[PDB]
Write an enzyme that holds these catalytic residues in place. Structure first.
Site, PDB file in Angstrom:
ATOM      1  N   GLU A 117       0.853  -1.172   0.000  1.00 34.28           N
ATOM      2  CA  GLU A 117       0.000   0.000   0.000  1.00 34.28           C
ATOM      3  C   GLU A 117       0.893   1.228   0.000  1.00 34.28           C
ATOM      4  O   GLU A 117       1.914   1.259   0.692  1.00 34.28           O
ATOM      5  CB  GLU A 117      -0.938   0.011   1.215  1.00 34.28           C
ATOM      6  CG  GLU A 117      -1.842   1.230   1.297  1.00 34.28           C
ATOM      7  CD  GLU A 117      -2.754   1.198   2.510  1.00 34.28           C
ATOM      8  OE1 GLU A 117      -2.645   0.246   3.308  1.00 34.28           O
ATOM      9  OE2 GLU A 117      -3.585   2.116   2.662  1.00 34.28           O
ATOM     10  N   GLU A 203      -9.607  10.458   5.192  1.00 36.46           N
ATOM     11  CA  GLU A 203      -9.788   9.540   6.312  1.00 36.46           C
ATOM     12  C   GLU A 203     -10.118  10.333   7.567  1.00 36.46           C
ATOM     13  O   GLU A 203      -9.222  10.985   8.127  1.00 36.46           O
ATOM     14  CB  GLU A 203      -8.522   8.711   6.549  1.00 36.46           C
ATOM     15  CG  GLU A 203      -8.148   7.722   5.459  1.00 36.46           C
ATOM     16  CD  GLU A 203      -6.905   6.924   5.824  1.00 36.46           C
ATOM     17  OE1 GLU A 203      -5.987   7.499   6.449  1.00 36.46           O
ATOM     18  OE2 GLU A 203      -6.848   5.718   5.504  1.00 36.46           O
TER      19      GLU A 203
END
EC number: 3.2.1.151
Length: 229
Positions: A117, A203
């Site tokens: 990631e 986020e």
């Protein structure tokens, strides 16, 4: 009209815009809605608005994002990944912990599960910080007009690299292949990995009456002229 369901999303020729309230139950209360505002060519404008309070204050509650639709390529064969993201972010006074970030994933196959990631944090608010094994940056690298501290840590079987901008970026313009190539040359990211996911959103950890308005977003994955399988 906005969509507020946990797994709501809207598809466009080049982008899918998710609400993606994947960890909403870790908050004590709250909700979140996402909407698409314009679509002109390969540029999209969208927004999301939320309140999340209580519960596990340390956990990401959601990740509304625009995701590029693209042909998967191994990193070794990517020529360029030009992207732009211009946004604004407001909220009410009081606790506000969140980030604005790109989220990219790689796998050993185009259809495989996540193995690496790569996040790129354009903004970190209220002390939000990425996954870090040591708690300390492993590097500081300048790409384009921005400097980034690089962090590394596991997430299950995934290795997570996170570039965090040293100053908040609200008007981002970059070639993300420079980030991936920095990782393949310096951090052991295999160039045989396929780039399988490219998204950009926010986020939230804690926040009230928050609203991120993405005034323009675009991304593209371009392959080299000579492909090596």
């Amino acid at each position: 009209g906005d969509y507020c369901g946990q797994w709501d999303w809207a598809k466009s020729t080049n982008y899918i815009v998710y609400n993606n309230l994947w960890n909403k139950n870790a908050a004590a209360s709250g909700s979140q809605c996402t909407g698409v505002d314009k679509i002109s060519g390969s540029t999209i404008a969208w927004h999301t608005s939320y309140t999340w309070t209580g519960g596990a204050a340390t956990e990401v509650k959601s990740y509304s994002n625009a995701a590029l639709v693209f042909s998967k390529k191994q990193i070794k064969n990517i020529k360029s990944i030009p992207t732009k993201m211009k946004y604004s972010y407001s909220h009410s006074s009081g606790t506000f912990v969140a980030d604005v970030s790109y989220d990219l994933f790689t796998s050993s196959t185009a259809s495989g599960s996540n193995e690496y990631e790569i996040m790129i944090w354009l903004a970190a608010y209220g002390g939000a910080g990425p996954i870090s094994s040591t708690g300390k940056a492993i590097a500081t690298v300048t790409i384009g007009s921005n400097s980034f501290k690089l962090y590394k840590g596991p997430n299950g079987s995934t290795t997570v690299f996170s570039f965090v901008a040293t100053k908040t970026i609200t008007n981002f313009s970059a070639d993300l292949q420079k980030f991936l190539s920095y990782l393949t040359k310096n951090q052991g990211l295999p160039s045989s990995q396929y780039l399988i996911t490219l998204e950009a959103g926010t986020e939230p950890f804690v926040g009230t009456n928050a609203k991120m308005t993405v005034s323009s977003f675009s991304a593209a994955v371009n392959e080299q002229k000579l492909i090596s399988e």
